[PDB]
Amino acid sequence: SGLVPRGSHMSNKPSKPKTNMKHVAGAAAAGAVVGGLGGYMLGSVMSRPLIHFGNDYEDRYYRENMYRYPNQVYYRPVDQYSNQNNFVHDCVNITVKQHTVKGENFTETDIKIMERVVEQMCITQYQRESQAYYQRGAS
């Protein structure tokens, strides 16, 4: 037998009284500036290569359109539940959205390489994400 009294758990302590009404953000307003992704990490600074073609044309083309398109990319933090694909999967899609955006368009031929630089940029990022992800200890 065993039907002892059990089933009592509670934890709540909202100690954050916010009675302030001063949320001024300086001065900046004109027309309208889009910006709604959700919360994806944005590359701050980098040095090493992101994509390696190997062919002359494929090489010159990349460095040629280098200024045409940005270098930053939206990616999420890795995890133990899944592999890099967890973030790399949407990493490419999201990038394609801002890449193929009406703001700028490229030829059918450019889309070929553009997809490579972006794709490789997603996986190549996993190396860094893991470097910081592995580190345990927030001092």
UniProtKB/Swiss-Prot annotation:
Disulfide bonds join 91-122. The keyword Metal-binding applies. GO terms for cellular component: Golgi apparatus; plasma membrane; side of membrane. It is found in: Cell membrane; Golgi apparatus. It is linked to Found in high quantity in the brain of humans and animals infected with degenerative neurological diseases such as kuru, Creutzfeldt-Jakob disease (CJD), Gerstmann-Straussler syndrome (GSS), scrapie, bovine spongiform encephalopathy (BSE), transmissible mink encephalopathy (TME), etc. Scrapie is a transmissible neurodegenerative disorder of sheep and goats. Most sheep that contract the disease naturally die between 24 and 50 months of age. The incubation period in sheep depends on the strain(s) of the infecting pathogen, sheep age at exposure, and the sheep genotype. Scrapie can be spread between flockmates, or it can be transmitted from an infected ewe to its lamb. The normal, monomeric form has a mainly alpha-helical structure. The disease-associated, protease-resistant form forms amyloid fibrils containing a cross-beta spine, formed by a steric zipper of superposed beta-strands. Disease mutations may favor intermolecular contacts via short beta strands, and may thereby trigger oligomerization. Contains an N-terminal region composed of octamer repeats. At low copper concentrations, the sidechains of His residues from three or four repeats contribute to the binding of a single copper ion. Alternatively, a copper ion can be bound by interaction with the sidechain and backbone amide nitrogen of a single His residue. The observed copper binding stoichiometry suggests that two repeat regions cooperate to stabilize the binding of a single copper ion. At higher copper concentrations, each octamer can bind one copper ion by interactions with the His sidechain and Gly backbone atoms. Its primary physiological function is unclear. Has cytoprotective activity against internal or environmental stresses. May play a role in neuronal development and synaptic plasticity. May be required for neuronal myelin sheath maintenance. May play a role in iron uptake and iron homeostasis. Soluble oligomers are toxic to cultured neuroblastoma cells and induce apoptosis (in vitro). Association with GPC1 (via its heparan sulfate chains) targets PRNP to lipid rafts. Also provides Cu(2+) or Zn(2+) for the ascorbate-mediated GPC1 deaminase degradation of its heparan sulfate side chains. This is Major prion protein. The gene is PRNP. The chain holds residues 103 to 234 of 256 of the full protein.
